[PDB]
Design an enzyme around this catalytic site. Structure first.
Site, short mmCIF file in Angstrom:
data_model
loop_
_atom_site.label_atom_id
_atom_site.label_comp_id
_atom_site.label_asym_id
_atom_site.label_seq_id
_atom_site.Cartn_x
_atom_site.Cartn_y
_atom_site.Cartn_z
N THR A 1 62.59 52.45 57.53
CA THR A 1 63.12 51.87 56.33
C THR A 1 62.58 50.54 56.16
O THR A 1 62.21 50.18 55.05
CB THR A 1 64.72 51.55 56.73
OG1 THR A 1 65.58 52.77 56.69
CG2 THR A 1 65.16 50.61 55.58
N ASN B 1 66.48 38.30 69.29
CA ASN B 1 67.02 37.61 67.76
C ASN B 1 67.09 36.06 67.77
O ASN B 1 66.82 35.40 66.66
CB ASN B 1 68.21 38.48 67.32
CG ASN B 1 68.15 39.79 67.40
OD1 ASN B 1 67.23 40.39 67.65
ND2 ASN B 1 69.07 40.54 66.59
N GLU C 1 52.27 23.71 51.75
CA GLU C 1 51.41 22.86 52.41
C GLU C 1 50.76 23.49 53.60
O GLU C 1 49.52 23.17 53.71
CB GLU C 1 52.22 21.63 52.91
CG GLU C 1 53.08 20.99 51.77
CD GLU C 1 52.12 20.04 51.09
OE1 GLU C 1 50.98 19.52 51.32
OE2 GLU C 1 52.54 19.46 49.69
N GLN D 1 67.32 48.21 60.07
CA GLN D 1 68.09 47.53 61.37
C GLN D 1 67.76 46.17 61.79
O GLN D 1 68.49 45.24 61.84
CB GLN D 1 68.53 48.71 62.39
CG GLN D 1 69.32 48.04 63.47
CD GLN D 1 69.56 49.10 64.39
OE1 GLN D 1 69.15 50.23 64.33
NE2 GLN D 1 70.41 48.80 65.38
#
Lengths: 432, 439, 104
Positions: free
Chosen positions: B145, B228, B254, B11
């Protein structure tokens, strides 16, 4: 006739090369389209040194851009003069170097090298006779340092009778761009001292300090440094580009100011470095230029030449002044500043004046000399290399490529020998 | 060219992927429909969108990411959204049974059932791409999960592509606050897999996010959306030189080459700055030296650890926006002489200069204001080793008489793995201690 | 090195200067000028100062190395040694020129 083939490597090398090409195009009167728009005299006769004759008088550049990342060619092509070069010369890979010398040399230096050798061979066969090859790159990455040494070795192996001059960028502990940078500088110095004619020291921190304390620029960026290195290159190359009274060439300079092939490093530097508000209040004369070429303030060094002794000095002038002033100035400098040059070898200064003044500036002159100041850079590089190689940090990346660790051992032995040689030639006593 | 594939497991991974995709579409002017209906007034979009999106023959954009989850509720929640017309249903694989903070089921009896489908999907996605450098695997250590399925998939991707970079992004169980109880049970097994089968790993928590938002953003009611958004801003800042260009482009390889000093020590310390709100971005003069100095402050770190307890191995600085090189040089000169910051007697310097011409953008309805420039920090220090020490202490104290272990026994797995993970983490901590010790 | 070649004298004086300054005596520019041009009196005067200072060391107590407890000396003398080398160069700006005339 006598032409010079130019080479490109590294993103910093690519940008400085593009800046130099733009500078010379503007100076010699070349429009961004590709035709000629000059109004001078010596800009048509010896113009074929860096250009090539084609139909309609449209001269084409002579420079091959070598890279591993396709993002640089897009950046340099969108510029005002990025539409004039040869797209065929833009040989780019698909994988970046990742600031790795061993990986760039091994993986990205096997299946891509053939194209650049083919194109440089085609360019060499296109002309009649050549003198040398100029490559501008940097030691900060796997792009410039990763393939510049390989290409120089290949061209020396194929054509031993050519000039190998380069302008690689030396690192600095104060201003660093790579964590494994001393590793790459270590690996590059071996090839530089084994398979290279001559090399010039390039530093960014010193140029920044110069433009801050003398030029007094508002927002100094990489464009300013690119312009400065382009001007230094033009002043170096004007001895052959624009002949005057006392003309010179690269090979004579390399023979005369390199006492030993193991020591071919130099110290470049311009002179009229003044602020914007000072340009209209200046005295254009000989003693001022001599002082600005002799003091350590105007040099582009992140070091101090006063710690050692002057070995070879060459003052290349570009203007219409005189002949007696230069010799009297160098004479009285050697008389006064006697403990700054090698006493055993007199007359360490070479006279050279270009009668053709540059475009946009009347009095210009560069300073090319080899003083005893790189010794501290060499010793600090050796110390940092020993420190990181003691516990072997950041070494699994190179080990996974396939190359072993003995290369580092032989390299550090080579730098120890070279620095020992440098310091025991620094105190060149007359006798016992 | 520079193209990468994103993986979203669990989730948290799915929501992070959605936030990243929406940030990318808003910053590139990509409309939610998938085409360019902007025929009257243009507002940008003429750039290199091929890094993440794809161009069709009809002028359509297809996201390149993997949205897999064992529980179908998250898939349905995203599906009923307003961006359902952007991705494809085949990219969102549902599932009958889920793990829900359980490793044994999701690694043996649940994750092993859907393997060929995701492998074929990722093979098709890779074939649809020309140049591949690294992957963006989004998961969590608490979510079963994102732990069992993620481990089994990455163990196969590692043996299927040895020349491709394998990144990691997940959430760390905070010592103070937590969501579940069996989180370190999955963490102790996921850490071994991420250490002995991956190249780099990024570790963050939520408590530090809460502290920084209440201290700077000054919110009394936080929400997952802000977290988020912060994570997406961090990801965009890291991969900034790929979609765009600048004075010194910094690709994935790099910085990844230098960010790993040793195969066992690949856990950098991220630091985003400035993390400020609207009113915190107006009456405040923003230069480079101040924000760089603030980047090393423990209060602005997303990992609860005092940098002064240890010292730094390798440092990686990134920049985004109108940044002047002289400011960077002055900041470097200042920090290199700072006695508070500690380092080894063997690394006097090491860092990167990433100049990005495109400044960070803003979002309508978000909390981030319009800042002229941004900076991202990735440093390597041994002071973060306490988190693994605390995790090992917790594992030892709850493994003494086997709390909540009989289920894992009944599901089918070796009890010796617990001791194996314990000894591997002990050896890793010993190696971190040895590296931290100077001469 | 006693050799008449003035590089040997530079070698000698490079070590003589700090020894002259472990007493605090002024190694003077005109002193070296009279050394190389051989004007009688200056180098003789400094040498006599050093002589009676040796007598001072032998008069009552400590050796010159133990004398350092009286007044802290080497607080700027670390810079003074380098300035002495640079001023030996500066003396070369006038004095070594005649020697260099034969070597140039």
């Amino acid at each position: 006739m006598r032409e010079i083939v130019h080479l490109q490597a590294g993103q910093c090398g690519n940008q400085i090369g593009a800046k130099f090409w733009e500078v010379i195009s503007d100076e010699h009167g070349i429009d961004p389209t590709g035709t000629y728009h000059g109004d001078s005299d010596l800009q048509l006769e010896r113009i074929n040194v860096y250009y090539n004759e084609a139909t309609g008088g449209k001269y084409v550049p002579r420079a091959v851009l070598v890279d591993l990342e396709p993002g640089t060619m897009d950046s340099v092509r969108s510029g005002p003069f990025g539409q004039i070069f040869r797209p065929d010369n833009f040989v780019f890979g698909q994988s970046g170097a990742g600031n790795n010398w061993a990986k760039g040399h091994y993986t990205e230096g096997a299946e891509l090298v053939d194209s650049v050798l083919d194109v440089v061979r085609k360019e060499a066969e296109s002309c009649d006779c050549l003198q040398g090859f100029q490559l501008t790159h940097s030691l900060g990455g796997g792009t410039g340092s990763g393939m510049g040494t390989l290409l120089i070795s290949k061209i020396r192996e194929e054509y031993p009778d050519r000039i190998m001059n380069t302008f690689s960028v030396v690192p600095s502990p104060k201003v660093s761009d790579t964590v494994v940078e001393p590793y790459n500088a270590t690996l590059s110095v071996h090839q530089l001292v084994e398979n290279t004619d001559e090399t010039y020291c390039i530093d960014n921190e010193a140029l920044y300090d110069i433009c801050f304390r003398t030029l007094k620029l508002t927002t100094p960026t990489y464009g300013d440094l690119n312009h400065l290195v382009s001007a230094t290159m033009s002043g170096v190359t004007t001895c052959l580009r624009f002949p005057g009274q006392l003309n010179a060439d690269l090979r004579k300079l390399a023979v005369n100011m390199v006492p030993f092939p193991r020591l071919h490093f130099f110290m470049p530097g311009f002179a009229p470095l003044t602020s914007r508000g000072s340009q209209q209040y200046r005295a254009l004369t000989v003693p001022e230029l001599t002082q600005q070429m002799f003091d350590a303030k105007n040099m582009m060094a992140a070091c101090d030449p006063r710690h050692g002794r002057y070995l070879t000095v060459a003052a290349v002038f570009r203007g219409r002044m005189s002949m007696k002033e230069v010799d009297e100035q160098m004479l009285n400098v050697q008389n006064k500043n006697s403990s700054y040059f090698v006493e055993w070898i007199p007359n360490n200064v070479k006279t050279a004046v270009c009668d053709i003044p540059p475009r946009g500036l009347k009095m210009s002159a560069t300073f090319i000399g080899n003083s005893t100041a790189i010794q501290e850079l060499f010793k600090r590089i050796s110390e940092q290399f020993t420190a990181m190689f003691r516990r072997k940090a950041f070494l699994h990346w190179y080990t996974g490529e396939g190359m072993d660790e003995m290369e580092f051992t032989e390299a550090e032995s080579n730098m120890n020998d070279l620095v020992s040689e440098y310091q025991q030639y620094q105190d060149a006593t007359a006798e016992e | 060219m520079r193209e990468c594939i994103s993986i979203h497991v669990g989730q948290a991974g799915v929501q992070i992927g959605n936030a990243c995709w929406e940030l990318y579409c808003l910053e590139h002017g990509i409309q939610p429909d998938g085409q360019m209906p902007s025929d009257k007034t243009i507002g940008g979009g003429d750039d290199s969108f091929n890094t993440f999106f794809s161009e069709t023959g009809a002028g359509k954009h297809v996201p390149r990411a993997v949205f897999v989850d064992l529980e179908p509720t998250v898939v349905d929640e995203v599906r009923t959204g307003t961006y359902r017309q952007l991705f494809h249903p085949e990219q969102l694989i549902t599932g009958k049974e889920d793990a829900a903070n359980n490793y044994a089921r999701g690694h043996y009896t649940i994750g092993k059932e859907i393997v060929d489908l995701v492998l074929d999907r990722i093979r098709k996605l890779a074939d649809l791409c020309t140049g591949l450098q690294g992957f963006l695997i989004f998961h969590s250590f608490g979510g079963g999960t994102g732990s069992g399925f993620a481990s089994l998939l990455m163990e196969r991707l590692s043996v299927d592509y040895g020349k491709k970079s394998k990144l990691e992004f997940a959430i760390y169980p905070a010592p103070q606050v937590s969501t579940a109880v069996v989180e370190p049970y999955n963490s102790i097994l996921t850490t071994h897999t991420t250490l002995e089968h991956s190249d780099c790993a990024f570790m963050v928590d939520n408590e530090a996010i809460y502290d920084i938002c209440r201290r700077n953003l000054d919110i009394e009611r936080p929400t997952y959306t802000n977290l988020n958004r912060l994570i997406g801003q961090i990801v965009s800042s890291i991969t900034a030189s790929l979609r765009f260009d600048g004075a010194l482009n910094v690709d994935l390889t790099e910085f990844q080459t230098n960010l790993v000093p040793y195969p066992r020590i690949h856990f950098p310390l991220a630091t985003y700055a400035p993390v400020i709100s609207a009113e915190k971005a107006y009456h405040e003069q923003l230069s480079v030296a101040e924000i760089t100095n603030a980047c090393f402050e423990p209060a602005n770190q997303m990992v609860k650890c005092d940098p002064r307890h240890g010292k730094y191995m390798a440092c990686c600085m990134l920049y985004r926006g109108d940044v002047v090189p002289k400011d960077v040089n002055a900041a470097i000169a200042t920090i290199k002489t700072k006695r508070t910051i500690q380092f080894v007697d063997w690394c006097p310097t090491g860092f990167k200069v990433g100049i990005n011409y495109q400044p960070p953008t803003v979002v309508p309805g978000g909390d981030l204001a319009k800042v002229q420039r941004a900076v991202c920090m990735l440093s390597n220090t041994t002071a973060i080793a306490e988190a693994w020490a605390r995790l090992d202490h917790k594992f030892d104290l709850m493994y003494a008489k086997r709390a909540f272990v009989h289920w894992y026994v009944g599901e089918g797995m070796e009890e010796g793995e617990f001791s194996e993970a314990r000894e591997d983490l002990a050896a890793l901590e010993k190696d971190y201690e040895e590296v931290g010790v100077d001469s | 090195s006693e050799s008449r070649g003035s590089t040997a004298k530079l070698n000698n004086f490079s070590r003589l200067q700090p020894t002259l300054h472990l007493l605090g005596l002024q190694f003077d520019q005109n002193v070296a000028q009279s050394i190389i041009t051989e004007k009688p009196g200056a180098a003789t005067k400094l040498l006599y100062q050093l002589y009676i200072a040796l007598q001072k060391k032998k008069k009552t107590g400590l050796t010159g190395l133990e004398i350092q407890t009286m007044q802290p000396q080497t607080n700027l003398r670390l810079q003074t040694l380098k300035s002495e080398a640079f001023r030996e160069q500066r003396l070369n700006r006038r004095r070594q020129n005649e020697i260099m005339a034969k070597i140039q």
